[PDB]
């Protein structure tokens, strides 16, 4: 059969910031402190705060509070980095800091002779190169950078075939350790998309189901 | 160099086979290890002998071995078996022939 040979790749950006908690979990958190405090056994912080002040009351009837004052001021001194570097930008969809809590995936625009399809990153292949080698080549053709992506195995993840002459696309999985994404305002249309906008850019039935094999969290 | 080993035979094994009529206290089968386990109306001595408790007819059957939970050796052999596995052992029963007594007319008072 005439096979148009297409290999492809969804990259998975690991989230660098842990998710905020849920209203039941913060009660599940604050309950988990109180039972832990009740089952603790005489820390030296409360030994030098409760046993001393009885004896400091003893010399006056005949300090640890100044220590804890030094620990509130440095907690307020060195201010925190932004967990949300998202609400300020809200339109920089090319940014690697587009969403810090979620899973992000490369997604660009390609143009065909008959189709104008927003696409997950693809490439043509030849049986001379291995399939894990095609996904190795996709890291540095359309991205034009010095990224460090990590594959796990050689097995595919998602297989949707469409015919015009026949064709198959093969979606593989990688993960960036770091990335030297030079010229992030490239000539392309790369968007890092969590989950809900993947149902917004990829409409047809062989592209509206990429979300079935990316990690849901 | 090989001295010892002049022990006689124990003469153990089945004394009353299948279908034999057996009174209470008759030793059914003497054994060295648990070859036959006791069943209905059959007791065990200290030396694993099987004596009969009622007057009846000896039957040998195969049923499911469920050991006692305090018998930690066999329970740790039970909990290594696969999920459909069922153990079986040969049991010795006595089917009691007589009833335990009748109601006889003593006197019209």
């Amino acid at each position: 059969s005439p096979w148009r040979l297409l290999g492809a790749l969804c990259l998975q950006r690991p989230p660098v910031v842990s998710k905020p908690l849920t209203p039941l979990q913060e009660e599940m958190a604050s309950l988990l402190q109180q039972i832990e405090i009740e089952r603790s056994l005489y820390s030296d912080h409360e030994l030098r705060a409760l046993d001393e002040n009885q004896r400091l009351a003893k010399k006056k009837a005949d300090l640890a509070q100044d220590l804890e004052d030094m620990w509130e001021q440095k907690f307020l001194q060195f201010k925190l980095g932004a967990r949300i570097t998202e609400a300020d930008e809200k339109n920089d969809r090319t940014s690697l800091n587009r969403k810090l809590d979620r899973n992000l995936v490369l997604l660009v625009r390609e143009k065909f002779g008959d189709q104008d399809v927003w696409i997950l990153p693809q490439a043509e292949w030849q049986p001379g190169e291995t399939l894990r080698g095609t996904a190795e080549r996709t890291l540095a053709t359309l991205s034009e950078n010095n990224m460090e992506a990590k594959f796990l195995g050689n097995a595919p993840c998602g297989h949707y075939t469409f015919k015009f002459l026949g064709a198959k696309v093969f979606f593989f999985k990688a993960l960036l350790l770091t990335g030297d994404f030079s010229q992030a305002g490239n000539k392309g249309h790369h968007v890092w998309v969590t989950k809900d906008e993947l149902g917004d850019y990829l409409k047809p039935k062989y592209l509206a189901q990429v979300r079935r094999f990316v990690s849901d969290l | 160099k090989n001295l010892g080993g002049k022990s006689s035979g124990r003469r153990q094994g089945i004394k009353k086979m299948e279908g034999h009529y057996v009174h209470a206290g008759n030793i059914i089968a003497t054994q060295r290890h648990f070859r036959w386990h006791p069943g209905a109306h059959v007791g065990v001595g200290k030396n694993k002998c099987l004596y009969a408790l009622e007057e009846g007819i000896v039957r040998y059957t195969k049923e499911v071995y469920v050991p006692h939970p305090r018998n930690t050796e066999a329970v740790d052999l039970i909990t290594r078996l696969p999920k459909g596995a069922v153990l079986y052992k040969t049991f010795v029963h006595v089917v009691p022939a007589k009833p335990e007594g009748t109601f006889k007319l003593v006197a019209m008072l």
Binding site: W3, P14, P15, V16, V17, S18, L24, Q25, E27, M28, L31, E38, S40, L41, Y42, E46, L47, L50, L80, G81, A82, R83, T85, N97, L100, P127, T130, L131, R132, F151, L152, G153, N154, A155, P156, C157, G158, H159, T161, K168, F170, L177, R212, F213, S215, D216 | -
Partner: protein, 110 residues
């Protein structure tokens, strides 16, 4: 060599008098016991999500090696092979802030 740190410290015996007061009222025990049930239903839902994304993706990935089996008999005998690059595997977890500005990198360390 069998040396560990599971051993309970000797200092955590003597002065066990710091909380001889373990008491709650009725309603504090009521609201906690409602929380343990609502968290019992919560993690049942969260592991129901992961039992979906494991099963459904394995459905797609076994149908992928079913599709790459039929349409290329020389290429599904190589997708089964193992990459020799996962032997020194290591990955940090997530954080609160992606790192910082430039500097200030200070502690006396002793």
């Amino acid at each position: 060599i069998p040396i560990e740190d599971f051993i309970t410290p000797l200092k955590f015996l003597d002065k066990a008098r710091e909380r001889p007061q373990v008491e709650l009222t009725f309603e504090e025990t009521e609201r906690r016991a409602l929380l343990l049930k609502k968290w019992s239903l919560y993690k049942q839902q969260e592991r129901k999500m992961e039992r979906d994304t494991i099963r459904a993706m394995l459905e797609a990935q076994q149908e992928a090696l079913e599709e790459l089996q039929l349409e290329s008999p020389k290429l599904h005998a190589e997708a089964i092979k193992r990459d020799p690059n996962l032997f020194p595997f290591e990955k940090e977890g997530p954080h609160y802030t992606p790192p910082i500005p430039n500097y200030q990198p200070p502690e006396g360390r002793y």
